[PDB]
Design a protein around this ligand. Structure first.
Ligand SMILES: COc1cc2nnc3n[nH]c(C)c3c2cc1OC
Ligand SMILES: [Mg+2]
Ligand SMILES: [Zn+2]
Length: 328
C-alpha cells in the first residue's frame, strides 16, 4: 500500500503563508530551496497557485496529496523529498517563463509529475535492479524505476481525499494522467540521449512544431531531464554540495555490489574519489551542456539554466587544474 499524511500535517500546510522576501527569490532559476526545509510543502502550494491560479485545486485535497507524497519518499542520500521539490521548482520557473506555450492541464500535470517523479526510490539504479534480477525488473523490462514511480503516483491519487484531478472532465482526466506518465518515463536518462538528438535535428532543419503532439511530448521530455538535473544549474557551492549527495548514493550502491562479490563501475566506487572531477567533466560534456543548449534553442527564456551550467563546468575544470578554494 501507500503511506498517508496525518490530519495535523495537511492542516498545518493549509495555514502556511510564505515569507514576502521569498516570493521574489522563487521566480529565479538559480533559487536553492536547501535552507528552507520547513517551508518545502508550502513552497510547492505557492508554486501551484502562482502557475495555475489560487483555485486550480481543492486546497484541502492538494494539501493532503502533497504531505502523502512527502511521506512516500525515502530517507536516501539523494532521491528524497528535497530532490522532488527541487525538480518541481525548476519546472515552475520554466513554466512561468513560457506560461501560455503550455495549457492549464499540462502545467497541473507537469508540476505534480515533478513532485512524484522519484516516489519510493530506494537509492538503487536500473542497472542494479536488472543485474540482480529484482522483482521490479521482471514487472518493468525497460525504465524499471520510472514505471514504478508512475505506478506509485497513480496509487496516491487513488487514496480517499487525495484525487486532486477527480473534478476534471472524463477526457481531460485521461489526458492529464498521460501527460504525467510520459513526463515520468522521460526522466529515465537512458531515453534522454535519443530524445535530444531527435530534437536537435528537428530544430536545425526547422521541422520543430509545438502544435505537433509528438513534438510537444519530446519538448516536455527534454524539460523533464532539464529539471531532473537542475543541481548543475545552481550557484557553485550548492551544485558542489548536491554532487556530494548524488555520489553518497552511488557509493552506497557500489558498497552493496562489493558485498555481493561484484566490483562496481568507478563512479560507484568510494575508493575511486580522485576520478570524480573527470567524471563530472564527462557528465557535463555528454549530458548537461547538450540538454540545456537544446532546451535554450527551443525555449529561449531558459537561457539562465545554460549560462549557470557553463559556469559550473568552468568550476569543475578549475578543480582538475588544482585551483579550488573554500570547502565545507
Ligand atoms: C552532478 O553529476 C551527476 C548528476 C546526476 N544527476 N542525476 C542522475 N541520474 N542518473 C545519473 C547517472 C545522474 C547524475 C550523474 C552525475 O554525474 C555522473
Ligand atoms: Mg528518477
Ligand atoms: Zn529525479
Amino acid at each position: 500500500h501507500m503511506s498517508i499524511c496525518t490530519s495535523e500535517e495537511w492542516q498545518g500546510l493549509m495555514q502556511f503563508t510564505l515569507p514576502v522576501r521569498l516570493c521574489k527569490e522563487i521566480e529565479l532559476f538559480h533559487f536553492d530551496i536547501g535552507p528552507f526545509e520547513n517551508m518545502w510543502p508550502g513552497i510547492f502550494v505557492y508554486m501551484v497557485h502562482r502557475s495555475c491560479g489560487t483555485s486550480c485545486f481543492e486546497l484541502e485535497k492538494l494539501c493532503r496529496f502533497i504531505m502523502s507524497v512527502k511521506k512516500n519518499y525515502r530517507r536516501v542520500p539523494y532521491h528524497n523529498w528535497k530532490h522532488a521539490v527541487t525538480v518541481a521548482h525548476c519546472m515552475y520557473a520554466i513554466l512561468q517563463n513560457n506560461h501560455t506555450l503550455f495549457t492549464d492541464l499540462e502545467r497541473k500535470g507537469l508540476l505534480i509529475a515533478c513532485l512524484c517523479h522519484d516516489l519510493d526510490h530506494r537509492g538503487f539504479s536500473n542497472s542494479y535492479l536488472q543485474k540482480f534480477d529484482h522483482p521490479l525488473a521482471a514487472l518493468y523490462s525497460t525504465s524499471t524505476m520510472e514505471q514504478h514511480h508512475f505506478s506509485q503516483t497513480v496509487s496516491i491519487l487513488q487514496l480517499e481525499g487525495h484525487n486532486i484531478f477527480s473534478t476534471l472532465s472524463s477526457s481531460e482526466y485521461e489526458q492529464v494522467l498521460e501527460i504525467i506518465r510520459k513526463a515520468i518515463i522521460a526522466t529515465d536518462l537512458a531515453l534522454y540521449f535519443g530524445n535530444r538528438k531527435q530534437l536537435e535535428e528537428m530544430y536545425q532543419t526547422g521541422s520543430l512544431n509545438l502544435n505537433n503532439q509528438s513534438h510537444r511530448d519530446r519538448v516536455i521530455g527534454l524539460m523533464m531531464t532539464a529539471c531532473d538535473l537542475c543541481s548543475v544549474t545552481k550557484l557553485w557551492p550548492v551544485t558542489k554540495l548536491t554532487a556530494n549527495d548524488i555520489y553518497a548514493e552511488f557509493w552506497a550502491e557500489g558498497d552493496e555490489m562489493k558485498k555481493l562479490g561484484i566490483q562496481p563501475i568507478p563512479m560507484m566506487d568510494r575508493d575511486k574519489k580522485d576520478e570524480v572531477p573527470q567524471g563530472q567533466l564527462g557528465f557535463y560534456n555528454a549530458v548537461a551542456i547538450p540538454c540545456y543548449t537544446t532546451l535554450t534553442q527551443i525555449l529561449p527564456p531558459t537561457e539562465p539554466l545554460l549560462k549557470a551550467c557553463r559556469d559550473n563546468l568552468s568550476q569543475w575544470e578549475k578543480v582538475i587544474r588544482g585551483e579550488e578554494t573554500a570547502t565545507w
